[PDB]
Structure 1
Amino acid sequence: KDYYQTLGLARGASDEEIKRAYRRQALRYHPDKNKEPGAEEKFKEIAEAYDVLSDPRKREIFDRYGEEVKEFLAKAKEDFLKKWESPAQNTAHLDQFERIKTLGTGSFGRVMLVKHKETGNHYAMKILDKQKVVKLKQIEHTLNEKRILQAVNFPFLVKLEFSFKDNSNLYMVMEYVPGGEMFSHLRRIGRFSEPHARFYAAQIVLTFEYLHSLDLIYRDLKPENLLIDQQGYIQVTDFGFAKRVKGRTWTLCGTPEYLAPEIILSKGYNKAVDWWALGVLIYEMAAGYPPFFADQPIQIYEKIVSGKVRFPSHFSSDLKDLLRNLLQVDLTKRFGNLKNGVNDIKNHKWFATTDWIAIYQRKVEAPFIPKFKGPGDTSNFDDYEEEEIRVSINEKCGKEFSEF
């Protein structure tokens, strides 16, 4: 409950500002003129918001909710920029790892379960072919990916443990999350109850607050890129499209259903497309299907710029309100991109039940803890045809991936 927003003030108002803003806001919800849409509680909310901000000792302890976060992030930025400036390189070698099965393949390259012969531990290893990456004009996205992932550190982001290259491949070794992708469960359980969705969505919300404070845009929020760990919590993978963006940026990339309008249109965009995608994720989670689909992507982009979302009937009224505000086609009105930034999502009626402190601390009861079968289980994961990895006797594209 943010007293500063309830009084429509900024964290640095003066002592007269809170007294007049209290009198300006108490009349706009007075129990005699605007005692209509149940706003007698918005009036009490204003009444309690003055009593705390008027008291310089009550205000000081309240100002320690923001300041704790402001500091938490400051140190996280500093820890990020030290790693950004000196990105780890060649921190392992292929022949340290026993290649087990394949865990997934696709538009990136190949992700296999591996085993470090010595520490006898379990990792995911993503193999990218240098020649195919330069083929897919994805050299700058691949270099980014390793650089943003080795430098970030957050409970809900997968952790890159090692990285290295040989003559024709780029190798990336990260923590092994065994519970499988949220996609496979969301399509087996059919959909998610609104509290279940609220669980995952809050982690995405804290993770986007972290990433955006680092000036990062993630640009691939999708249930196929979220994993569930043994505590039922969320681990994000695929940083193939993540960019460090202090201003605007222009690449149309992502996944058609999840693209914000401004990505599809030729105007630049900001972090705010990550909040749009979050609206798609909460919608697909709570309904079973994404808000905009079609067999041809251009028809998906027609729906996306229409600014028309049909909501399902079992969609709560508070969810319908949060979604109307995340799927706003005008990024100058979209939630997350307004004056109070992410706090508009956090202090929203659909998120009144949720403890952002406790969600961070991994304390909450995860409404679904997947099936555990020991150390190397690939049961929560589809099977794939195995290829053998050839290693050319000539270095390929040594110039393009110097930085890797």
Structure 2
Amino acid sequence: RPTFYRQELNKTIWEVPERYQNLSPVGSGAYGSVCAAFDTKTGHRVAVKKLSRPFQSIIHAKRTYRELRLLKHMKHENVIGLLDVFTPARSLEEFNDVYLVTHLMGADLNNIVKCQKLTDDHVQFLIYQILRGLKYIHSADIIHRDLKPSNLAVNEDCELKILDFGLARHTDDEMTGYVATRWYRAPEIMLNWMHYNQTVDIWSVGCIMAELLTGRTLFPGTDHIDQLKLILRLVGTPGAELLKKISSESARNYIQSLAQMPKMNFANVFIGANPLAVDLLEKMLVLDSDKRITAAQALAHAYFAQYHDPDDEPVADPYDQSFESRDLLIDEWKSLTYDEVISFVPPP
């Protein structure tokens, strides 16, 4: 067991191993506080995330377990990777606090795309890395669900990592009105049309790739309905085949109230873009999710000819998510989380 020291950082007590020095607050969502630090063991500038009220309810306790299981599994260049997890507790009986550690990232896609100049070569490399990471995530039957520019970390050399997996956190109010939180969402999940699957992430990659090419948001809707009208104007109103797959009758009833529109010409929307970029956007931005290109199929598209290497696009170990259908008490979720903290093995 390392030695721990205590310090108060913006109204909060932090108890961390001596290896972590020069702690300084970076911010706080509603589910945690984050400090920057120097790790004397690895020599990395690290990002440390402390959880707020991890075991306050059954919902919160299960979310804490879900986040720790997911972060312990992900071992890929283009996805967030765990360096450490710790608790100052010496037993299950006094266990209350969880701390998570990752290699530090100082900016998102918004920081590097708006406030710089992107060649087609930059767009190829950034979208290649997102799809390399997604092939790995999807091979473990994991769905991200919340891909958007603020959840993609990018460094000086244009190297990219996916972070902030959807842990089923987003509220009704967070998705309301003129908000970036909704602009990258597939229409089947925005309006609860049907049981969704991993194809929802490919829709989000299409919206991100269009925005890198034009410098503008693809579907900046003022509300759920305005956004659907923007989507259907580009990709066309649904045919009988997709309408049958919408399980919600009221959702089906509303779509059928809209005047029929054909799919637009993408060469006339994305004026001047590489024709191979236009062709890939047409294969991602398909209304019927059954017919979208997969991450594994997209990596072999001629747009990425420069970067594609089928011997260096790895898949994940199997990931058991049977806990998701399990009904347990707070103290049972807390015991499972404790076991995952003490069994952690750091990377080499």
TM-score normalised by L of structure 1: 0.56
What is the CA–CA distance in structure 1 between the aligned matches of 2:230 and 2:307, rounded to whole Å? 32
- For 1:5-404, list aligned pairs within 5 A: 94-96=15-17, 97-98=20-21, 100-106=23-29, 108-116=31-39, 121-130=44-53, 139-165=61-87, 169-178=97-106, 180-189=107-116, 192-229=118-155, 231-241=157-167, 255-266=181-192, 267-304=194-231, 307=235, 311-336=269-294, 342-343=296-297, 345-356=298-309, 401-404=334-337
Letter in 1 for 2:105: V
CA deviation after TM superposition for structure 1 residue 169, in Å: 4.5
The whole-number CA distance in structure 2 between the counterparts of 1:99 and 1:331 is 48
The structure-2 alpha-carbon separation of the partners of 1:268 and 1:207, relative to structure 1 and needing over 3 Å to count, comes to: same
Q: Is the 8 A contact 2:35 2:49 kept in 1?
A: yes
Aligned in 2, Cα 1:352/1:131: closer, same or farther, shift over 3 Å?
Answer: closer
Q: 1:211 to 1:105 in 2, by over 3 A?
A: same
Give unpaired runs (5+ residues) of structure 2: 5-14, 89-94, 237-263, 315-329, 338-348
Q: Per the alignment, do residues 299 and 144 of structure 1 end up closer, same or farther by CA in structure 2, a change over 3 Å counting?
A: farther
Q: CA deviation at 1:133?
A: 7.8
What is the one-letter code of the residue matched to 1:316? N
Identity %: 25
CA separation in 1, counterparts of 2:311 and 2:78? 13
- For the aligned residue pairs, the C-alpha RMSD in angstroms reads 3.6
Q: 1:334 & 1:91 partners in 2: Cα distance?
A: 50
Kept in 1, the 8 Å contact 2:113–2:212? The answer is yes
What secondary structure, in the 3-state scheme, does the structure 1 residue paired with 2:167 have? coil
- Aligned residue pairs: how many? 264
Normalising by structure 2, we get a TM-score of: 0.64
Using the TM superposition, give the Cα deviation of residue 214 of structure 1 relative to its aligned residue in structure 2, in angstroms: 1.0
Distance 1:118 1:321, change over 3 A: closer
